[PDB]
Amino acid sequence: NIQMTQSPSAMSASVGDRVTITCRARQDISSYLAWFQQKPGKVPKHLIYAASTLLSGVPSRFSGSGSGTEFTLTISSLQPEDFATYYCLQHNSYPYTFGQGTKLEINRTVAAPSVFIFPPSDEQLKSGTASVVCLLNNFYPREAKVQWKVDNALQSGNSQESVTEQDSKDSTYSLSSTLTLSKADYEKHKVYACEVTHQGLSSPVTKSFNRGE
Amino acid sequence: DIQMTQSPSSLSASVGDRVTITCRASQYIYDDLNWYQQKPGKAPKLLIYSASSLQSGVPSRFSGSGSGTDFTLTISSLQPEDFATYYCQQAWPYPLTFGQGTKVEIKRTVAAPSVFIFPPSDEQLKSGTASVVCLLNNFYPREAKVQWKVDNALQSGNSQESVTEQDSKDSTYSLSSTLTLSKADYEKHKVYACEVTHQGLSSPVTKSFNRGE
Amino acid sequence: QVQLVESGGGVVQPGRSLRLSCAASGFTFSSYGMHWVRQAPGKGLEWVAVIWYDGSDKYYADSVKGRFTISRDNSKNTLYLQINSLRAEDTAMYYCAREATAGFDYWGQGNLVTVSSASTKGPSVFPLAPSSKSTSGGTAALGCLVKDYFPEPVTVSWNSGALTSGVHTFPAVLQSSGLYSLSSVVTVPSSSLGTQTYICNVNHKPSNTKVDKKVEPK
Amino acid sequence: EVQLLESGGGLVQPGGSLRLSCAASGFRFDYEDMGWVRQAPGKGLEWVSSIDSHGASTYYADSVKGRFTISRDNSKNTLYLQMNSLRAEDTAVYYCAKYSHSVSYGPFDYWGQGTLVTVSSASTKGPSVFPLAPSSKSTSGGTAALGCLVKDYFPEPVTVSWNSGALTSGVHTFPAVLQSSGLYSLSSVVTVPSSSLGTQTYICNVNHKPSNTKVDKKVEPKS
Amino acid sequence: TNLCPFGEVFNATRFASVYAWNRKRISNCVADYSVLYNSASFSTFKCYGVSPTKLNDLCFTNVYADSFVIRGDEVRQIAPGQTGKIADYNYKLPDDFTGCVIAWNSNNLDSKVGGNYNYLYRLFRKSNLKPFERDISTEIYQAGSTPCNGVEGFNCYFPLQSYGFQPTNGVGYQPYRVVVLSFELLHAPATVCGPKGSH
Ligand SMILES: *[C@@H]1O[C@H](CO)[C@@H](O)[C@H](O)[C@H]1NC(C)=O
Ligand SMILES: *[C@@H]1O[C@H](CO)[C@@H](O)[C@H](O)[C@H]1NC(C)=O
């Protein structure tokens, strides 16, 4: 096994910045180093082989460099659609080996979330369960604190968060949080609130409803 | 200069046999002797160089030996694709020379010819010449005596023979003997006979026709 | 059109066997070597194996040698990966990839293999109804909650494909129960709520669940 | 792939002249030493001439010294053999060949296909194709023989097939014989079931490219 | 009846690429070896199976002068039982080698401003050369699982690479002319003798 090591594991850069990602091989692999791009929810895309040869269709801002044990992938003018995980692979000798990957995120200006709330459906309430959903739409940076408050009581252990991967065009994120209570526990309280803290919000924003809608 | 005597000029062998061909040079030529194979209608193919070196891609059952003036080519375990003509070749000094070749043919059982006689067509006679054709079909071994008799008069000087290569399927030979006469000399005689003697016949076979029938 | 369509994955119990297929069409399959690559969930790419164009030479990663065997049938135009003695480390998306002079230029879409002793559970599908608490400006949000299923994956479309813009189908998250849940939301013009109906189409093939839920305002 | 392709062969009158070419490809020509080897019809190989990579040294067999000149053009990847004062005994297939190492060590490892050179007073002429009709006295229900006599053509080669290629088994196309007239003659025969003579037709197809002659002839039973 | 034509080999106006290395037979002549070694203008002069001082006292048979250009760091490979791109893929000496390897620096001649890319070497081959084999083919080398069919691309390599000798190269990356003299010890009528050689 020729061990492959990439650095850094993750990074951010602004649109138009120059980005370099490093791949190190534990043995000399001459110039037999490939680069791949994987956007969340898509097949890997082969970008470069033999350290520096671009595959057809790869934009000009992508470039490859190196020989021996030290290789770089350079993006000379980072575009929002370049958000991805990038992998190196030595094709010097079998078995072919991948490095562990570098996740590349786009730094952009601060954008505040739009906060929506969704009370449980009659279908789920009839099933014996209540799920409230808080949606935060199209924000940056990724860090956002969503807190659930039932009658001003901070919940924990009964909620769940999912965050979209960075958007390919505008580089924002969306977040959904589900608070799940039993129907019985749900009907013991009135005010169901979602309180979101985000760098683009002057002070925490609260979206709430009363169980008797 | 330097003469090269290759012997034998032909030999018959069976798949599996060990075949040795010899080459004698008139002067001392160290290891500067090469060996080629040639099949009907194709270019020669290098088998061995510098007396004993096997050319890349050539099976190891071919082996070369000898030095000074006497050289041998050895095919251990003859394969079906090995039946062909072989040539030695002096490589130094100039002028170069080849041996006269050894044809390695395949053995099979004695087989008697089928004999056919063909009188000249009426078209050819109209053109003013007559070819009588005698055919010996599928026989073995190659040696065959074909004797034309025109009204019991043995002929000579007016016939030509041609022999196919060994058939790829039954390993036999076929021979054609053409007696060529002018129209006037042809229509001056009555009985045209082809007499064939061959190892596979207990007594000579005669095919004949009488002009007119 | 070059197409590599994979099949043969799904839930499997530890220690049993599986055989993944990659059916090739749109090119001369016997003229190209083929590779298998996999990716455990949330983890990096992993090179699995390669087979020569004619079926002769084969090579394996160290972690799979002796347990995996790569094979191919050039008359059926099909590549195979046989996996015996399935363990937890084998849970992954598996991809086939053609090797060409242009590179690894064509990949199959991926086939998920889940090594589990647990029973498959199809999801419940609940509407996220639009209301004044989900509109802002000319925009309203509505969606579908796809709750309590195992294993992955779930697919969600809107209006059988017709509705595509403004759709966020969130990545599934594990719950404390060990079952997955995801939500799919769409933002539409707030005015269009009274004139357009919105139906989410959820498919969970492991449990053969297909559900179309109409999302009506409230 | 290393390739050597000869051209310039054909028919030439005694005393005449012909220049053969060999086009090389698939390797750096100016690194290799080259030669010419020839083969008369039905006879062995005969080394003709050799040249080293830059033409500084040339070598000739006694049988061609003074009449043949070997040369090369490395910019055009081409080997030349200028043949003057051609004689009948110069009729042969001419093979271009390459030394594996150099003129002073090693064999010819790569050979061309060869071009035929014919030295003769004769003039190009298509064959007369006559029928060798099957015997009326052929075995009850056994085997019969029929054929075609391809007479008085020049120069070689001629090709013969039967029923445009449909009939293959039992076909013998004999080596041509050079007649005293300086023209060539050969026969093509085939054995067929005696019972098939009334039913199936037999046509021999003769092609003489040097004269653009394509003859078909139906060989039919006797009266 | 001749003095051996060592000037034609050593002072040759052009040198071959190592992959298409040049072989000149030397026969029917008297070789003064001492005029080469005593005129020591050579960075390398190592013999195998004989001693350089006893060469003028010897008679040989089957004497060959192979010659080519390589890099300084590759001269090490022109020796019995070596490994590397040159020895494996371009020029391989037998382990039983009897002969002398001679080499000198040719930067003055084989380097040009902007690079001299005329000299080539073989970088890939399906197997190692047998001793004294010579491979001049240019077929695309298939390094992967898909046959190249004469197309260069991913894992499909032109088998030859240029050296690119530039005058400012480091000494190990500078061109060296190499001449290998191959002898066979006397067991047949002698073809080449030193000035004081015994038949
Ligand atoms: C993005 O850039 C701003 C300033 O340009 C910086 O303060 C912030 O830390 C950056 N974020 C990341 C993730 O690099
Ligand atoms: C090369 O030429 C010089 C004179 O220009 C001469 O002194 C030297 O001996 C020659 N080398 C050989 C090997 O003949």
Side-chain angles (χ1 to χ4, degrees), chain C residues 10-14 18 38-44 46 67-68 83 86-88 90-94 111-117 150-152 180:
Chain C
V11 202
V12 277
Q13 326 209 307
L18 218 44
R38 73 180 175 174
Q39 184 165 40
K43 304 321 211 166
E46 204 187 334
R67 221 160 45 79
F68 291 31
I83 318 165
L86 270 165
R87 339 172 190 159
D90 296 327
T91 288
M93 192 79 55
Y94 288 74
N111 212 263
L112 197 61
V113 171
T114 310
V115 176
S116 175
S117 66
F150 179 79
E152 297 241 72
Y180 293 99

Side-chain angles (χ1 to χ4, degrees), chain B residues 45-125 127-152:
Chain B
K45 173 177 192 290
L46 174 69
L47 302 167
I48 275 151
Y49 67 99
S50 294
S52 57
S53 284
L54 192 63
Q55 170 73 357
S56 277
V58 171
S60 36
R61 62 175 178 277
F62 295 86
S63 148
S65 168
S67 205
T69 48
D70 284 276
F71 302 86
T72 61
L73 173 67
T74 300
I75 324 169
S76 69
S77 188
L78 205 63
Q79 290 311 288
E81 60 265 29
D82 296 344
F83 296 98
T85 309
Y86 294 85
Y87 292 93
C88 50
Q89 180 238 327
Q90 166 189 331
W92 190 264
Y94 287 79
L96 316 182
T97 186
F98 290 89
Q100 38 270 301
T102 294
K103 202 177 185 188
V104 173
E105 300 170 292
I106 181 157
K107 272 175 209 141
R108 61 144 293 144
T109 58
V110 53
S114 304
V115 179
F116 305 88
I117 192 160
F118 293 98
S121 57
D122 283 324
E123 291 97 314
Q124 197 202 358
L125 278 176
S127 95
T129 48
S131 298
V132 202
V133 166
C134 188
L135 172 69
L136 288 50
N137 209 50
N138 299 347
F139 61 90
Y140 187 92
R142 146 76 178 91
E143 182 195 278
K145 201 173 51 83
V146 177
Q147 203 102 70
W148 286 99
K149 289 173 196 175
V150 171
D151 287 324
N152 302 321

